[PDB]
Amino acid sequence: DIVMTQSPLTLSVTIGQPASISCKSSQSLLYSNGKTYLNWLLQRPGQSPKRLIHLVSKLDSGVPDRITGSGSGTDFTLKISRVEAADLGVYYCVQGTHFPYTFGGGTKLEILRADAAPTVSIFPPSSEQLTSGGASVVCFLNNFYPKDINVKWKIDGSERQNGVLNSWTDQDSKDSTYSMSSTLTLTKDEYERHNSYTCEATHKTSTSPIVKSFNRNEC
Amino acid sequence: EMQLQQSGAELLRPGTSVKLSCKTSGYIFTSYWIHWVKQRSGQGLEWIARIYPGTGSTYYNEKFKGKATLTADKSSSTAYMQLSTLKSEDSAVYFCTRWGFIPVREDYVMDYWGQGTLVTVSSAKTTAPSVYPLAPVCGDTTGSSVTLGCLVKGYFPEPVTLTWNSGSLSSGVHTFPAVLQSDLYTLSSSVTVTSSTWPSQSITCNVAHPASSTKVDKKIEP
Ligand SMILES: O=[N+]([O-])c1ccc(O)cc1
Ligand SMILES: [Zn+2]
Ligand SMILES: [Zn+2]
Ligand SMILES: [Zn+2]
Ligand SMILES: [Zn+2]
Ligand SMILES: [Zn+2]
Ligand SMILES: [Zn+2]
Ligand SMILES: [Zn+2]
Secondary structure (H helix, E strand, O other): OOOEEEEOOEEEEOOOOOEEEEEEEOOOOEOOOOOEOEEEEEEOOOOOOEEEEEOOOEEOOOOOOOEEEEEEOOEEEEEEOOOOHHHOEEEEEEEOOOOOOEEOOOEEEEEOOOOEOOEEEEEOOOHHHHHOOEEEEEEEEEEEEOOOEEEEEEEOOEEEOOOEEEEEOOOOOOOOOEEEEEEEEEEHHHHOOOOEEEEEEEEOOOOOOEEEEEEOOOO | OOEEEEOOOEEEOOOOOEEEEEEEEOOOHHHOOEEEEEEOOOOOEEEEEEEEOOOOEEEEOHHHEOOEEEEEEOOOOEEEEEEOOOOHHHOEEEEEEEOOEEOOOOEEOOOEEOOOEEEEEOOOOOEOOEEEEEOOOOOOOOOOEEEEEEEEEEEEOOOOEEEEHHHOOOOOEEEOOOEEEOOEEEEEEEEEEEOOOOOOOOOEEEEEEHHHOEEEEEEOOO
16 A cells, blocks of 8 residues: 655644645555545544645635645645644645555644643542542643643652543643643542642743642641 | 534444444435545544445455445435444544545545544443542632632543533633543543632533433532
């Protein structure tokens, strides 16, 4: 089958700047009728894919002409002349010249923006949960940029690496930021045996760890 | 207006089969090819097969012969794809699409896609989630604004539906992707409001887990 190689794997561009994606094929995509069936698709977060270009450079109806496609043979390029917020997502090249049809691996386009320090929130176990014999301590690290961040949990001054569950959101199309959730789960008995619970983050926006904690006690 | 409506998420046992449906409207069903595409783990797309409903003619990607069987019902304008003897690699999201290529004109018409059907191949059992309200203490963000949370855990399989104030509250909410651990998923969502709103007016977390017929509303009390 034809192998389609896309580069780069990800690109970070500031709104207003140009961006271009490359797609290389293992066989020439020139069909015997002289036509080249190379398409470009965009799959926005949580959406189905959508065709942007067909026949190498022809734009589908309703697609902004800021988008341009070019190439022939085994080399093709998609170029966005001016990046906008709505351009966030994954771009794929697909060939229909040889059977079976094959797709490239995709290129994720992320909007490069100003650094943003996380807004951190920490939540102790709810009464309902404690009742069931479990205890989860949740920490939300909201709206930060860049995406690269490191969070560690500490109980009474010692790092706890077991029982941690982390989840991240994709880039927000409203402000180009990322958010992440970290949950530490313990038994109710162990929870009620410690004092301090600390959510500690490492991020570019600070030379020292970003900290949020609480002391569980009684009264 | 063209519309391709796909069937709901499926949890399938290893070795069994499923029939997915793609109901179309807004165009002459018998005049265009319907293609089926598979997406695994995220950015990993594959072309499966295509069918021309008008005649029932089909073509398959060799990899999928014997795995997928496409049919179409002209009377209801519905395309189906049956997947047989499911195994690990079959867990994925499947899309149907009216690709829009017109051979005679050697040109295209707009592509319309279904929303996708998620298939989970597992023998693990269905479990309803526990929903816990997360009221601040330190996660108060002081005054100005405050963030509340909702923790959904111990459920199987995906998906779960989580909203705030029955959909009314959609701004400042962050719903995190569920993470699988020990055969059970965990999901959480945060909502940031002004100090002036909460606890003054009530904020409620709404959760639904279709697979187990669970629907629960949790109120964030202080
Ligand atoms: O994704 N699709 O439905 C496709 C992709 C490429 C192609 O040539 C035909 C159909
Ligand atoms: Zn060929
Ligand atoms: Zn050939
Ligand atoms: Zn200790
Ligand atoms: Zn000690
Ligand atoms: Zn301790
Ligand atoms: Zn101690
Ligand atoms: Zn055209």
